[PDB]
Amino acid sequence: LEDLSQKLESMLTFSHLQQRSAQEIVHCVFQLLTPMCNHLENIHNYFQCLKVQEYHIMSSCYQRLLQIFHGLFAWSGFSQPENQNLLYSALHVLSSRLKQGEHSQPLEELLSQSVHYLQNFHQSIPSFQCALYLIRLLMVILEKSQNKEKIASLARQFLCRVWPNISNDQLHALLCIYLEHTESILKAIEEIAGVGVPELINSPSSTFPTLTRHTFVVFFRVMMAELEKTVKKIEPGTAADSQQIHEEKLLYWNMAVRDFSILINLIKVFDSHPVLHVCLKYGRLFVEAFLKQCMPLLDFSFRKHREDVLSLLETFQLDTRLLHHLCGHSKIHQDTRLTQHVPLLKKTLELLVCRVKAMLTLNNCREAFWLGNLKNRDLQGEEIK
Amino acid sequence: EPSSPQFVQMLSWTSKICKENSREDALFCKSLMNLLFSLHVSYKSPVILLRDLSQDIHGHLGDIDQDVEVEKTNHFAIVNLRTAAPTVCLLVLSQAEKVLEEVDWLITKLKGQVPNQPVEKAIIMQLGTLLTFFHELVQTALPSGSCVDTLLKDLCKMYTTLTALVRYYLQVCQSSGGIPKNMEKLVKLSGSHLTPLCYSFISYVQNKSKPAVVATAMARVLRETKPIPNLIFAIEQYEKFLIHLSKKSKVSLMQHMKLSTSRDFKIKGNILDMV
Amino acid sequence: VPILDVLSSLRLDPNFLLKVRQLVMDKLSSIRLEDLPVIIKFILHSVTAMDTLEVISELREKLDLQHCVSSGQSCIILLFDVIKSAIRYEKTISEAWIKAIENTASVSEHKVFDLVMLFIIYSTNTQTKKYIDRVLRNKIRSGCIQEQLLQSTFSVHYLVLKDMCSSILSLAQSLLHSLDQSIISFGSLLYKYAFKFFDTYCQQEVVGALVTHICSG
Amino acid sequence: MQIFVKTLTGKTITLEVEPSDTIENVKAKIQDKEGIPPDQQRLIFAGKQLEDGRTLSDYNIQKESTLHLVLRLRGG
Amino acid sequence: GRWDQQYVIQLTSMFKDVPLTAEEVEFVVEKALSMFSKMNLQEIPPLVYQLLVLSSKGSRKSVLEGIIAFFSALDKQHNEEQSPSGELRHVEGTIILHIVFAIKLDYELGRELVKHLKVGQQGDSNNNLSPFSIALLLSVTRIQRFQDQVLDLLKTSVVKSFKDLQLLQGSKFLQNLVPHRSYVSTMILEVVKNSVHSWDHVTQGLVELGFILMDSYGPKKVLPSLSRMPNQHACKLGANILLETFKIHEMIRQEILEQVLNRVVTRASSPISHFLDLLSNIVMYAPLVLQNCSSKVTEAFDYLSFLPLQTVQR
DNA sequence: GAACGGAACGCCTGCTCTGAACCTGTGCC
DNA sequence: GGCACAGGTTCAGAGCAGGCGTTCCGTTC
């Protein structure tokens, strides 16, 4: 199976192989894998429901199998219709791995049967990588259609289990998969950021484990990136759009902003190179999204829905300030690696200021825009001199 | 011919007219000055010229502190409250830009090489002189119009040029172990005189606030946003490259400069009357 | 028709000219082939600067070029010679044409005449080559211009492009350099059919060009 | 009349021929006095690749003027 | 060890077949290139052949550096002796031809060459180039893969030469600092002046460059100084090249003229003044050739209604 | 000795250079 | 009290440079 996974990886994403077409190889592989490695997969499940070197081997076999399945099912010749008769026979096989009689069945029903079969492995698995392959497999089976909830429950189980080491990138990919399928990204980070704390309270390893003093980094990274990606998707309409839609947009904004505030406040406890490296690199992206896709809405809904906007901006100052402090901190402890990403941040903040000025300028309240220079603090709260 | 005595007496006479006469017309003044630069540059650099003028502007127009007592009209006569604000600011600023083009051009040529010593020396003397120019300008209560935008975009040009000088020095001092004292003194000046004022200037411009098609209003306002940010970005980028050089010199160039001042805003109880 | 010869060759106001232009354009598809080049020549120097996109679109959607299909191929060569005489300098019509067809890149039912014109105008104007280049590189990408058009193109409209060998070959060469194997596929199909239906000189030229792309790129 | 050729080993070689004679004649003489056939030869004067059907009058080639050779091995 | 100046080529060729490091190929090439000075001339090209095919597996930039230093310095020696040719330029031509033909195999050499003579920062274009290097590049041009990059290089090299000279002239400070190097325009005309020595694989490239310049940098914004003044010294150099080329090379005067007339005729949508000024200058040198383009001449006279007035008149 | 940060060659974005015309403001008849 | 010239401004286009995206080597534990 090491050998066969090597060959598929080469072929899709070794000479005697390459003198054949992918279609030929996959066409043969249906007959060369499906019913008889399904037996072997079932046998692994039987074993893993329950000397150590065999266990290591059997885990390796399990991941190699599922890797083969993913390498199979993601073939871009199942996009085109020719290889899809093959897929219909394959699905027939996977469904008939439990139950027979439902012949020439609707495609989607057969998908449900296959994935419902693939559900039952969730507890057997010993290691991370297996889980990941399984999930990626399911997701690429399922896109042939709501169903996110099943992926989400599964991902949450496999983020929440014990996992007796683990490499960061695996987890990165798993949590990307979690968050892009969850209902509410915002309350997800909020839950996880009232839980970034018990890493400090309890264990010098939490109630959401896979969260060592190491692993915080990757959580943070993904929470920042996926949040910034989320809010970028919003389109501000016009005053033709109802106050109602504006209200829910603003609440959405407000939740995202306080989320961001909560994220950034975690820097004082977790000072390092790379956690800083993240908030610098991501903060600017957040703010830019805020400029390009809030400010026009505020221009629209100023004169009616103003007090919300003022609470919003006032709140947003209270981490903007932290970010400026961070820039200063980064300059003082003269760390090349962080300072690289300062000046675009700076430039981005001042541009926020000036955009607000312009925002009032349109609404005929320009003179009210007063400035004040800022006290110089570190991250904790001083007036450093 | 530039070196010919007739060029020389001509230039000198011109300068006497510029030292002598008020002459409250604008264009007349503008034409004289343009004449003067277009001669002078063929003779030698125009910076001490620029310095004298900037001082005279400061003396005539005011200061942002509203409380420093100053007059240096004696230098160059062709100034009033009518003359010097919306005209001569621009003109002298456009001459400074020509200087900064010349110097960035030198610097590119030096990185070309990889002769050097007098090159750098002349560059630094130039830069320091007109850095002093910018000092006397930046303390000034200019108007909210064009000359103010012009100045921001010439500062950006300034800092950028310094950044380029610094980047030159990166590629040198790593090989040898350098920063001759001139450059140090220059950065000392860049910190002390210019930068903190820059921030104070911006306080002035932004706090200074005192019918138009909505789409073209959008065009106007969004054109009005960029330069101050582009300034920031240039400053910070000076600072960043200093850090690098600090790391690769065994010197704190940042012991000279200061914690970068930054700007938080507010809103007040005026919106109420407007609605 | 000889009225149109005369009237085309006269000083007349653009308003009566526009009247008679419509008196022609209503009677386009109701005609034999024999008469069309002298008609079309008149039409090519009846247009304004502002009725250019409208009349190119009107014309291009109205025509057959296939109902007529050894007087057929001979009088279509004369039609194309009339087109060669009008495209050469009147850029207000040539750019109008380029942009009249790029704007009809939505519908994949745009036909032989659209590509014949691409080749002719690519050969014609040294200057507007790269707008054509970019238009076709976007066009090809959309699941538009495909083989079957090229097939019939070179199957019937070969005598016109028989002359424009190196035009085709330059296009092909410029295609095969880049990525997006659709590009490369089409540029290869171009060589194949071009080599197929053309003279032995053309064939000699093709293989020369091919071995050049081989030793070189 | 006398002329020179030099090659990839630096074998300065002296060729006696009339200027009205042609280039393939010199290739024959190279096959004769040096054993190198014509088709492998590539003859140059002063940055011009010399063809067969020409002569030394065509290229203004004169007494003791030095030619250059290489071995154009098709395969190698 | 000291090298018997006669039989050093064979010695050099011995290093060819031994597989060496970069260090040992570097040692041999640097010493063997230092040997160039203390020789007769005519032995050098086949030496260069062996150097090159060895240089295919080692340090090649080093060889080109040494080559160009050698030939640029000696060109300047000749120039100062002027203010020893009929062999010298001949050997140069042959060398150029060798290196072109060797690039014909290995293209990495092409890219390493061009990186060496990449202007990049403009001050490199005041130590990079000589007339000799330029001649090299214009000979290189003939490879269809290299007719873009080389010409973008020469073109943009020439425009930046003029942007420097304009800016230097309009300052005195800079004149008090710098001593005037050579500027690309005058190098290119020395080359053309010295193309009488009659290697003509250049001349097609030259022609091509002249046409590029006049095509690109000719009045199109004109139907300032920055966009105007040093993109007219370009055009003028184009036309100046062609006219000068034309006075020397009686093989070429036909093809120039057919291309020019194609340019004059098909356009006159665009302004083509520079071309007609050129054409007048050409004919006023030697009208006889215009018998040979009698064909295109008479073809124009069928188009001479559809052309506008000024065209026709000049 | 390994990994993570510094580093190089190409394409797209956007920003700038420039021109041209409209329009509106001021001074003189 | 109105008309003409100027100057600002703005838009449209086009062209080009730099930064990030992919891919690899140095430096610091």
UniProtKB/Swiss-Prot annotation, chain A:
Annotated phenotype, changing residue 242 to A: No effect on phosphorylation by ATM
Tissue specificity field: Highly expressed in germinal center cells of the spleen, tonsil, and reactive lymph nodes, and in the proliferating basal layer of squamous epithelium of tonsil, esophagus, oropharynx, larynx and cervix. Expressed in cytotrophoblastic cells of the placenta and exocrine cells of the pancreas (at protein level). Highly expressed in testis, where expression is restricted to maturing spermatocytes.
Modified residues (Phosphoserine): 242
Post-translational changes noted in the entry: Deubiquitinated by USP1 as cells enter G2/M, or once DNA repair is completed. Monoubiquitination requires the joint intervention of the FANC core complex, including FANCA, FANCB, FANCC, FANCE, FANCF, FANCG, and FANCM, and proteins involved in cell cycle checkpoints and DNA repair, including RPA1, ATR, CHEK1 and BRCA1, and is mediated by FANCL/PHF9. Monoubiquitination prevents DNA release from the FANCI-FANCD2 complex. Phosphorylated in response to various genotoxic stresses by ATM and/or ATR. In contrast, phosphorylation by ATR on other sites may be required for ubiquitination and foci formation.
Domain of life from the UniProt record: Eukaryota
Protein family membership: Belongs to the Fanconi anemia protein FANCD2 family.
Disease implication from the record: Fanconi anemia complementation group D2: A disorder affecting all bone marrow elements and resulting in anemia, leukopenia and thrombopenia. It is associated with cardiac, renal and limb malformations, dermal pigmentary changes, and a predisposition to the development of malignancies. At the cellular level it is associated with hypersensitivity to DNA-damaging agents, chromosomal instability (increased chromosome breakage) and defective DNA repair.
UniProt free text on domains: The C-terminal 24 residues of isoform 2 are required for its function.
Name the record gives this protein: Fanconi anemia group D2 protein
Species assigned in the record: Homo sapiens
UniProtKB/Swiss-Prot annotation, chain C:
Subunit structure: Homodimer; cannot be ubiquitinated and does not bind DNA. Part of a FANCI-FANCD2 heterodimeric complex that binds and scans dsDNA for DNA damage. Interacts directly with FANCE and FANCI. Interacts with USP1 and MEN1. The ubiquitinated form specifically interacts with BRCA1 and BLM. Both the nonubiquitinated and the monoubiquitinated forms interact with BRCA2; this interaction is mediated by phosphorylated FANCG and the complex also includes XCCR3. The ubiquitinated form specifically interacts with MTMR15/FAN1 (via UBZ-type zinc finger), leading to recruit MTMR15/FAN1 to sites of DNA damage.
Linked pathology: Fanconi anemia complementation group D2: A disorder affecting all bone marrow elements and resulting in anemia, leukopenia and thrombopenia. It is associated with cardiac, renal and limb malformations, dermal pigmentary changes, and a predisposition to the development of malignancies. At the cellular level it is associated with hypersensitivity to DNA-damaging agents, chromosomal instability (increased chromosome breakage) and defective DNA repair.
UniProt similarity note: Belongs to the Fanconi anemia protein FANCD2 family.
Region called Interaction with BRCA2, residue ranges: 6-92
Post-translational modification: Deubiquitinated by USP1 as cells enter G2/M, or once DNA repair is completed. Monoubiquitination requires the joint intervention of the FANC core complex, including FANCA, FANCB, FANCC, FANCE, FANCF, FANCG, and FANCM, and proteins involved in cell cycle checkpoints and DNA repair, including RPA1, ATR, CHEK1 and BRCA1, and is mediated by FANCL/PHF9. Monoubiquitination prevents DNA release from the FANCI-FANCD2 complex.
Subcellular location: Nucleus
Stated name of the protein: Fanconi anemia group D2 protein
Species this protein is from: Homo sapiens
Domain notes: The C-terminal 24 residues of isoform 2 are required for its function.
From Swiss-Prot, chain D:
Protein's UniProt name: Ubiquitin
Residue ranges annotated for the Ubiquitin-like domain, each copy included: 1-76
Residues carrying the site annotation Essential for function: 68
Result when mutating residue 65 to E: Phosphomimetic mutant that binds and activates PRKN
Effect in UniProt of substituting residue 68 to G: Loss of DTX3L-mediated polyubiquitination of histone H3 and H4
Taxonomic lineage of the native organism: Eukaryota, Metazoa, Chordata, Craniata, Vertebrata
The protein's role, per its UniProt record: Exists either covalently attached to another protein, or free (unanchored). When covalently bound, it is conjugated to target proteins via an isopeptide bond either as a monomer (monoubiquitin), a polymer linked via different Lys residues of the ubiquitin (polyubiquitin chains) or a linear polymer linked via the initiator Met of the ubiquitin (linear polyubiquitin chains).
Cross-link annotation Glycyl lysine isopeptide (Gly-Lys) (interchain with K-? in acceptor proteins), location: 76
Effect of residue 65 to D: Phosphomimetic mutant that binds and activates PRKN
Effect of residue 72 to A: Impairs ubiquitination by CRL2(KLHDC3) E3 ligase complex. Impairs ubiquitination by CRL2(KLHDC3) E3 ligase complex
Residue numbers bearing the (Microbial infection) ADP-ribosylthreonine modification: 66
Phosphoserine found at: 65
Post-translational modification: Phosphorylated at Ser-65 by PINK1 during mitophagy. Phosphorylated ubiquitin specifically binds and activates parkin (PRKN), triggering mitophagy. Phosphorylation does not affect E1-mediated E2 charging of ubiquitin but affects discharging of E2 enzymes to form polyubiquitin chains. It also affects deubiquitination by deubiquitinase enzymes such as USP30.
Top-rank taxon, per record: Eukaryota
